[PDB]
């Protein structure tokens, strides 16, 4: 064949830290269908937002918003435990169906996005050029968000370890941990990946007695 229908830009959803996670890559032939399992960002999260995006940028805010919906009734559980299956199905007429189902509760929500939605030919060309020109910066943003999320994992696992340790953890150790947690918290608001990792390293240095407990 010398011609066929494609979806012209990547389609995905916003994930933790303001990043776009792709479900359907740009130039995929249509009809097409793809599913991916997601989980919750925070402990005890009972609702999630499915924000549908079109584009090639790593920052969710830089892509074209197609629509959004909420999925609630998720049993409050530790972060990473819920299994939220997100499906993107584009039919032969370019109609996009997005659904999200929580595997444990069976709760499901969906949206239909018309084929005419999104960016036009000139905006598609500008999106491709802008993604290309900002490739290094978008990579750096993605690396920062991963570090910010890992930074949060170390902050989360340390705090769980401290509460479990209780009275057994000495005062000198606990005070050094509390201050190092604050320094990490502050660096996380910044955009310097190395500064975050350094505050993570400083925390781990004062948590040696905590890891033993």
């Amino acid at each position: 064949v010398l011609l066929l229908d494609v979806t012209p830009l990547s389609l995905g959803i916003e994930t933790m830290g303001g990043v776009m996670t792709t479900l359907i890559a740009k130039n995929t032939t249509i009809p097409t269908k793809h599913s991916q399992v997601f989980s919750t960002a925070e402990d005890n999260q009972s609702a999630v937002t499915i924000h549908v995006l079109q584009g090639e940028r790593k920052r969710a805010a830089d892509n074209k918003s197609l629509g959004q919906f909420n999925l609630d009734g998720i049993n409050p559980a530790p972060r990473g435990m819920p299994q939220i299956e997100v499906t993107f199905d584009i039919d032969a007429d370019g109609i996009l169906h997005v659904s999200a189902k929580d595997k444990n509760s069976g709760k499901e929500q969906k949206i239909t996005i018309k084929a005419s939605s999104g960016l036009n030919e000139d905006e598609i060309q500008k999106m491709v050029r802008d993604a290309e020109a900002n490739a290094e910066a978008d990579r750096k943003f993605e690396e920062l968000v991963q570090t910010r999320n890992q930074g949060d994992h170390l902050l989360h696992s340390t705090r769980k370890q401290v509460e479990e340790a209780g009275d057994k953890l000495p005062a000198d150790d606990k005070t050094a941990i509390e201050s190092a947690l604050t320094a990490l918290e502050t660096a996380l608001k910044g955009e310097d990946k190395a500064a975050i990792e350094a505050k993570m390293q400083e925390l781990a240095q004062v948590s040696q007695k905590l890891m033993e407990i």
């Binding site: 500008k126 050029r129 802008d130 020109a133």
Partner: peptide, 9 residues
């Protein structure tokens, strides 16, 4: 006077 970039080539 702030300066403006040219359109992406």
């Amino acid at each position: 006077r702030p300066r403006l970039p040219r359109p992406r080539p």
